[PDB]
């Protein structure tokens, strides 16, 4: 095979160009994203029980749904919430890798059975099963520059002209609006309704009848008269437009001729929602839009399309109105991708430099350099074939691959160079002899570097997904490298390499002469040291045992984590005032926070966008969210301008604040995994005690977490108990009075909340018509008698007759996790503390809690625990696979055992590097450790294969291994330094996702350094000891 | 390999027989169709909101569905229509190659979320998601010869006895009816109603309560007792109404050759074969015809199988003529009959192997595959011709035996055959990877030609050496030439011309500089011709049918449209009597929409044999009609040919969507539409530019004030019910007719629902039971509304369709339309759809295809011959063929369409073939050590005859295509002309330039040793 392409260089060039072209086509047709999926598919079930208390809703609907949904295939955990507004939601998070459509189908199938057990009112209302989505791509703030357009006017214009077209952009699953358009709201006064003996149902029916558009046929229908002139459609009536027309709805005509107009019994206004969001941008009134990513779509492409359309719409904006990007994800993605590309290019440059250092000839340096683009573009082609994308994980895998893929080419080139220098052969003959000598070595190196990354793909969960990204990439790179090393590189060595060795051009005075002298002296000293340690076995055996002990000690000592957080240039601060606080108090707190960010962080904040209030449908106005976008990483300082610092300073300043709970939290590492960064914990109530006991336990846990300095920003992801109305309707009592359940339910909705009747045309735009009770009347336990629902006989039966209301204090939102009443508690570790340590502290604290309360990590915390548990298996399986492959290749059990003894030498170095740098045992460290295992195996192989060949030929074991070390010292050193300087840009990257680059690079670089400086001595020791223990048959 | 089959010919014969048998098996089991599945799949979501205006329907239903359907995988574009009748449809077109079933399933899944958001009435009606067939395979008109049955009689029979059986026929997706079954129509009389003091609601309530035990005859309905007086006298329905057995829907009025008739529109189920389904349907109809009442007979008004069958037969004829011409030219160069037969035997073997490959891949016998076969016929014989020519030359010069000559020849030309197969197959490989309809077309040709090339090389290395060693007579010149007639003169002329050619090649080699400037001029001319050449997607074909559509001003009645229809029928019967077989008009149906002001007319021309070749062409008669129809100012009448691809578009020409990007409103959009139409009418490069929709129609809006309505104690529901019953139609109950359950409708009589003031003739029953006139609480008012509202990709849009003027390509027309849209007021933009979108896609993707194909050929040659010099010498001759292809296309008048693109690829392959046939021998001789000039001159001298015969075989193979006159003449011309010109130029220029390129490259890069 090697000789075939040695004699046919053009064929090898053609194959290389084919690979390059396929890669170039793939690169321009590959989607770009930060992380590929990595999020378990969640399916949400939503049910509504109007006028139902939280406890009643949970008991009647939520628990039934939970019971029926148990037994789903690949289900991971269930999270459910029961709200006081009458809406119940049960989120079903499935195992990662599961197709969302199948999960939705199964959920719907079980909901078919579950529905009949639900209350009939809920069944009539409807139950929805949809994939969650819930990934806010960007938040857009619309602010009036001139100030001419009022905040309500801005909200109306946005919801009328901007929300509709943006909702139809590809990949836009949902677009939340932080402002409500104008609507024909009618405020019923029950005093007037009772005065004229008209119920709310009469008003609703009259509005339906008198505001409608019905087509009644055609003027000049098809069976027409002999000679007609027109064929026109006929409409019964038209939709009301002005509020005055609504005030003229008749509702009755008395025998005297008096009419009870709608304006006489109620008040109509073309206003907005009662409790619409009080959104602000940079201290100015504004509206907002929250664009969410549709499940299974590219965030970058969707954001580009959305922004583009917004630009188009902007062209036709009213004067003074302009949009602002208050929140954006694509920035970081682009910055991180470009930074990793720069790191890859610098890695290629450093590999070229080190190869040129070892190989003075420029062509001899080019020959392995040409392998880099070919293998890289082939890897891109393979990624395109398997449907992968250009993400951070794949680019990290590519940068890690660079050194491994150039290893075989370097080995071939330097073997050819050594043969040319020593035996004085022609480049073609030297290349042929080199291929004959080291055909086995290339295969062994590729096997060891690819066998490590095979078992990873099989693992499941998000961790498995991350591993797979690296596996596919690295395995494809290794396969192409071993293919390139036996196809392209031999031809390049045969042709490009001039016979300058015969020309005796070597010997030029300069830096390279000094380098060669130093290398020769060090090689002689190294061989002497190898001989000495082979004579003095026991001392270095003891040293190896000590190294094993140190490796175990560092493995136990190293803190653990899942993924390093990155400065995305953005963070969110959440404000939660004491329950019952008005919107104005929350606004004042928000203003204080805005002032703090404007004066203290003036050099870093680009824009702050606040969203006061939970919204028109929200129960409380004491909750606000503040989207903060920092300036470009470049502009912000690298020491104090970092989000992590800014967040720490803000956290101290906000803990100083006692008016309300204010927490500044960075966005989560993975978009779909969780809500915010840090650990996520559910405080389950296993004993089944009361909700008050759970609340007391939650308060105690929060106090204990505040006590611990290792924990910071610990908060409850929920709402505190507040007084809430419980309008209870006695169906038997009502039907005894002969009053329809539907009518009383509609009246309850109209009074307690809002009722949608129909649409009306405003300026050519259809807008909804809402009928609501007057401001003082909200179906209080006091005014429930004021409302009447006339029975079938027509008698106005008072609502108080068949129903009762009471102000009962309780939790507005009841949460239930995996069939236990639980409160979700989230928080972050203190600076210098890993997430795993924080989780251990939280477990200790929950142990300190009264018995019956347990914890169960969810989302990112759950998958971090999964990865931590599965890591030892991953290593064991990878080591076993490597050992088996080595045994198969060399048809022996002594050689692989000799090789596998070198793995601790690299593992100790990786552990030391990560420990000294201050990093932690996260997913990246785990993938690194596997790379270090493969690299140590490669370094051991380079010596043991040659020594074993010499032994099988019959050479003396001691002399054979000494000769092997003498010959292969240069290959090990240069294939090692190529990788060490390949990952050097990663370990020293600045900006973008520098955190992930550091986490990946540092461990592998340290592991490589230790692997070389220890293997070049210990590998002879292990091989000699094993062969003496188990000599060959001859 | 070759020597093995030379020693064992029986095994080669067995392999050839196996290939032939497999091909014959495949031919009989391959579907026959015009085109493969080229049209992108479409999924239509229909929702029917009864009693809703178009604007309300769009606001409440169409927009919700559009919002929810966003996010579908492989979605090209989304189009929706909101009709004033109350039916909304959203058409989702996915990328070509997407599985229709997967698309439908995904649409249904994503619709489930949208179901609750829709208005309750819409949900109760039920939204339907189904594949969009929308391909009228067969339009049957039923007419009564004796005149015994009226239009309704015919319609009922059709609906009762014919529509149902044909629906169950396999492959029939939908069967549209241009008529409706009977329905016991009850025409109310307001004067009679007032005389007896009864409202329309009383009649409706009585009838709905009258009811198996259902009334049968109208006389039973006339005796229905509405009420009984105290005196014992009763008021019957006949006293107050006129009951007759009419139609449930009076929408359509169909005429066949001026005679009343009813029609059926048969639509193809997705995936079904068109020809087989049409054959099944017609057969079934004939069976049903066995029981037709006297006089009633069905007549086909629109059929596609005729043109498909005729085109396939024509392509088979041109294929056979190509084989004959290839045999003739080979016999011209190879005077021996057996030497001519040996490559001829390869043609059936390779063809049947290609058919077997097509069957294995699941392809079918369509026009594209057949064109590819015809091209391959010239292509495939190349290797066999080379082998036979080399054997003949060895036998003539060395005098060896046929076995020894074949054995020497195979070793001599082993490389040449592989190179020829590589170059003729590497061009068509990348083309297959392109997507869309264009990609599909490309793939058809690729799969066919690549399989043919592989099989041709296999036959050349297996079967042909055995034939040469056995069939060829050792006495090649036992009686010398043996012909002193035409063959002797031809041989003398060829020898003299070959000597002149060699001398000229030597002269051109000596004078290198002069001809390099000529090559640069040829490059410049090639670029200029490529830029100047107009572009298109596919050639239109005379399919024997065309459709004219009538659209009167909005508000026109059915009779007014019928008058224009009769005028058009008179025009067709007078001016186009000798070319038109039949015309089938359907008042009330139109491509833009349905209404009394729109009519669609189907015209079937006579067979191509009867119609004149110059003045009887579909294009010519259509142009004459458009010249005549533009004089008609009563209505907008446009005669259009069927689209090139059935599922791609509604009609031929371009198809754009003028959409409102600024949301200026519907009125601004209509004003822009009118301005654009005026501009298009002004331009002479455009013709038949029309709006594929309905203009705003007058609407009579009733205004009821509720104060006086409630003052008189009148319910709004009652006044709406009376209005619907009188002006519209009320479905009271059912009645059984001849064992069939049919509807009963109540409506006001014609004279009493014909003017706006007729509202005052009706009365409503108040709470007290009194009669209140409508004039008391109702006033009418005229307004204006849009019967049908269209949206495209979210934006409100109006679909503008049209055709380029004769002599103008579709690409030029699209550019003109883009300029006109630019002339429109700001805020309006355009987006090409249907075939026009695919045309733009192909035009964008063509340069990539060319570059990638050229690169692939270069790399394959470099790998094969292990030298960069050889492909660079070869690839320099590609422009020499491209210039000829462009020149032939420009001279004939064709354009740069898909066929031209596939041709250019074939021309590249052929130029590479000739360049290989020279440079392979030249390079081998130079490698041996021979002088470069001597080597190249010897290569030219030896390979002139193989090149000339392998090229004449191809040119005369494609000559029948370029001169065809059958059904699919346009496509055959488009395919054949460019390739024929490219081959001609490639030969007559390469045979001189290839030596120059090779010598120049070798002198610049001399072989080291």
PDB file of C-alpha atoms in Angstrom, chain A residues 423-536:
ATOM      1  CA  UNK A 423      22.462   5.164   5.619  1.00  0.00           C
ATOM      2  CA  UNK A 424      22.800   7.879   2.964  1.00  0.00           C
ATOM      3  CA  UNK A 425      19.978   6.495   0.835  1.00  0.00           C
ATOM      4  CA  UNK A 426      17.947   8.292  -1.801  1.00  0.00           C
ATOM      5  CA  UNK A 427      14.674   9.839  -0.586  1.00  0.00           C
ATOM      6  CA  UNK A 428      12.632   7.194  -2.418  1.00  0.00           C
ATOM      7  CA  UNK A 429      14.603   4.236  -1.047  1.00  0.00           C
ATOM      8  CA  UNK A 430      14.725   5.836   2.396  1.00  0.00           C
ATOM      9  CA  UNK A 431      10.956   6.364   2.341  1.00  0.00           C
ATOM     10  CA  UNK A 432      10.324   2.770   1.264  1.00  0.00           C
ATOM     11  CA  UNK A 433      12.571   1.398   4.008  1.00  0.00           C
ATOM     12  CA  UNK A 434      10.997   3.729   6.576  1.00  0.00           C
ATOM     13  CA  UNK A 435       7.489   2.573   5.688  1.00  0.00           C
ATOM     14  CA  UNK A 436       8.620  -1.039   5.931  1.00  0.00           C
ATOM     15  CA  UNK A 437      10.149  -0.366   9.345  1.00  0.00           C
ATOM     16  CA  UNK A 438       7.337   1.638  10.961  1.00  0.00           C
ATOM     17  CA  UNK A 439       4.157   0.351   9.311  1.00  0.00           C
ATOM     18  CA  UNK A 440       3.299  -1.333  12.606  1.00  0.00           C
ATOM     19  CA  UNK A 441       4.061   1.741  14.705  1.00  0.00           C
ATOM     20  CA  UNK A 442       1.606   3.961  12.820  1.00  0.00           C
ATOM     21  CA  UNK A 443      -1.185   1.398  13.171  1.00  0.00           C
ATOM     22  CA  UNK A 444      -0.467   0.998  16.875  1.00  0.00           C
ATOM     23  CA  UNK A 445      -0.473   4.752  17.471  1.00  0.00           C
ATOM     24  CA  UNK A 446      -3.747   5.183  15.592  1.00  0.00           C
ATOM     25  CA  UNK A 447      -5.302   2.271  17.487  1.00  0.00           C
ATOM     26  CA  UNK A 448      -4.321   3.570  20.924  1.00  0.00           C
ATOM     27  CA  UNK A 449      -5.354   7.133  20.073  1.00  0.00           C
ATOM     28  CA  UNK A 450      -8.726   5.985  18.689  1.00  0.00           C
ATOM     29  CA  UNK A 451      -9.596   3.128  21.062  1.00  0.00           C
ATOM     30  CA  UNK A 452      -9.792   5.501  24.039  1.00  0.00           C
ATOM     31  CA  UNK A 453     -12.516   7.617  22.431  1.00  0.00           C
ATOM     32  CA  UNK A 454     -14.726   4.740  21.225  1.00  0.00           C
ATOM     33  CA  UNK A 455     -16.327   3.773  24.539  1.00  0.00           C
ATOM     34  CA  UNK A 456     -17.240   7.388  25.289  1.00  0.00           C
ATOM     35  CA  UNK A 457     -19.859   7.624  22.573  1.00  0.00           C
ATOM     36  CA  UNK A 458     -21.826   4.753  24.068  1.00  0.00           C
ATOM     37  CA  UNK A 459     -22.422   6.622  27.324  1.00  0.00           C
ATOM     38  CA  UNK A 460     -25.787   8.359  27.644  1.00  0.00           C
ATOM     39  CA  UNK A 461     -27.204  11.601  28.974  1.00  0.00           C
ATOM     40  CA  UNK A 462     -25.817  15.033  28.259  1.00  0.00           C
ATOM     41  CA  UNK A 463     -22.419  13.852  29.380  1.00  0.00           C
ATOM     42  CA  UNK A 464     -22.601  11.143  26.767  1.00  0.00           C
ATOM     43  CA  UNK A 465     -23.597  13.690  24.164  1.00  0.00           C
ATOM     44  CA  UNK A 466     -20.596  15.843  24.960  1.00  0.00           C
ATOM     45  CA  UNK A 467     -18.340  12.826  24.785  1.00  0.00           C
ATOM     46  CA  UNK A 468     -19.795  11.788  21.465  1.00  0.00           C
ATOM     47  CA  UNK A 469     -18.985  15.150  19.945  1.00  0.00           C
ATOM     48  CA  UNK A 470     -15.337  14.693  20.831  1.00  0.00           C
ATOM     49  CA  UNK A 471     -15.314  11.008  19.956  1.00  0.00           C
ATOM     50  CA  UNK A 472     -16.610  11.274  16.418  1.00  0.00           C
ATOM     51  CA  UNK A 473     -14.270  14.139  15.680  1.00  0.00           C
ATOM     52  CA  UNK A 474     -11.161  12.626  17.261  1.00  0.00           C
ATOM     53  CA  UNK A 475     -11.787   9.123  15.889  1.00  0.00           C
ATOM     54  CA  UNK A 476     -12.336  10.474  12.375  1.00  0.00           C
ATOM     55  CA  UNK A 477      -9.178  12.563  12.704  1.00  0.00           C
ATOM     56  CA  UNK A 478      -7.130   9.545  13.811  1.00  0.00           C
ATOM     57  CA  UNK A 479      -8.470   7.312  11.036  1.00  0.00           C
ATOM     58  CA  UNK A 480      -7.692   9.971   8.437  1.00  0.00           C
ATOM     59  CA  UNK A 481      -4.254  10.594   9.954  1.00  0.00           C
ATOM     60  CA  UNK A 482      -3.308   6.921   9.744  1.00  0.00           C
ATOM     61  CA  UNK A 483      -4.711   6.894   6.210  1.00  0.00           C
ATOM     62  CA  UNK A 484      -2.839  10.083   5.290  1.00  0.00           C
ATOM     63  CA  UNK A 485       0.362   8.830   6.925  1.00  0.00           C
ATOM     64  CA  UNK A 486       0.344   5.740   4.676  1.00  0.00           C
ATOM     65  CA  UNK A 487      -0.852   7.454   1.478  1.00  0.00           C
ATOM     66  CA  UNK A 488       0.119  11.115   1.231  1.00  0.00           C
ATOM     67  CA  UNK A 489       3.116  11.433   3.553  1.00  0.00           C
ATOM     68  CA  UNK A 490       5.170   8.597   1.954  1.00  0.00           C
ATOM     69  CA  UNK A 491       4.740  10.165  -1.490  1.00  0.00           C
ATOM     70  CA  UNK A 492       5.609  13.597  -0.112  1.00  0.00           C
ATOM     71  CA  UNK A 493       8.735  12.192   1.536  1.00  0.00           C
ATOM     72  CA  UNK A 494       9.710  10.456  -1.707  1.00  0.00           C
ATOM     73  CA  UNK A 495       9.237  13.540  -3.910  1.00  0.00           C
ATOM     74  CA  UNK A 496       9.498  16.786  -1.926  1.00  0.00           C
ATOM     75  CA  UNK A 497      12.495  15.765   0.184  1.00  0.00           C
ATOM     76  CA  UNK A 498      15.671  16.790  -1.591  1.00  0.00           C
ATOM     77  CA  UNK A 499      18.702  14.532  -1.098  1.00  0.00           C
ATOM     78  CA  UNK A 500      20.375  17.310   0.883  1.00  0.00           C
ATOM     79  CA  UNK A 501      21.702  14.659   3.279  1.00  0.00           C
ATOM     80  CA  UNK A 502      23.989  13.423   0.497  1.00  0.00           C
ATOM     81  CA  UNK A 503      24.790  17.060  -0.275  1.00  0.00           C
ATOM     82  CA  UNK A 504      26.132  17.391   3.282  1.00  0.00           C
ATOM     83  CA  UNK A 505      24.520  20.811   3.712  1.00  0.00           C
ATOM     84  CA  UNK A 506      24.247  20.044   7.439  1.00  0.00           C
ATOM     85  CA  UNK A 507      26.769  21.801   9.667  1.00  0.00           C
ATOM     86  CA  UNK A 508      25.786  25.461   9.183  1.00  0.00           C
ATOM     87  CA  UNK A 509      26.750  27.549  12.204  1.00  0.00           C
ATOM     88  CA  UNK A 510      23.893  29.147  14.091  1.00  0.00           C
ATOM     89  CA  UNK A 511      21.124  28.423  16.547  1.00  0.00           C
ATOM     90  CA  UNK A 512      20.385  25.035  14.986  1.00  0.00           C
ATOM     91  CA  UNK A 513      23.983  23.877  15.457  1.00  0.00           C
ATOM     92  CA  UNK A 514      23.760  24.665  19.172  1.00  0.00           C
ATOM     93  CA  UNK A 515      20.366  22.964  19.380  1.00  0.00           C
ATOM     94  CA  UNK A 516      21.724  19.824  17.715  1.00  0.00           C
ATOM     95  CA  UNK A 517      24.728  19.777  20.052  1.00  0.00           C
ATOM     96  CA  UNK A 518      22.483  20.117  23.109  1.00  0.00           C
ATOM     97  CA  UNK A 519      20.131  17.431  21.803  1.00  0.00           C
ATOM     98  CA  UNK A 520      22.975  14.994  21.130  1.00  0.00           C
ATOM     99  CA  UNK A 521      24.516  15.505  24.566  1.00  0.00           C
ATOM    100  CA  UNK A 522      21.129  15.135  26.254  1.00  0.00           C
ATOM    101  CA  UNK A 523      20.384  11.991  24.241  1.00  0.00           C
ATOM    102  CA  UNK A 524      23.672  10.423  25.339  1.00  0.00           C
ATOM    103  CA  UNK A 525      22.964  11.343  28.964  1.00  0.00           C
ATOM    104  CA  UNK A 526      19.421   9.988  28.602  1.00  0.00           C
ATOM    105  CA  UNK A 527      20.693   6.641  27.327  1.00  0.00           C
ATOM    106  CA  UNK A 528      23.169   6.483  30.213  1.00  0.00           C
ATOM    107  CA  UNK A 529      20.364   7.199  32.671  1.00  0.00           C
ATOM    108  CA  UNK A 530      18.147   4.545  31.099  1.00  0.00           C
ATOM    109  CA  UNK A 531      20.946   2.002  31.478  1.00  0.00           C
ATOM    110  CA  UNK A 532      21.467   3.016  35.109  1.00  0.00           C
ATOM    111  CA  UNK A 533      17.776   2.768  35.995  1.00  0.00           C
ATOM    112  CA  UNK A 534      17.578  -0.598  34.233  1.00  0.00           C
ATOM    113  CA  UNK A 535      20.385  -1.757  36.525  1.00  0.00           C
ATOM    114  CA  UNK A 536      18.770  -0.101  39.582  1.00  0.00           C
TER     115      UNK A 536
END
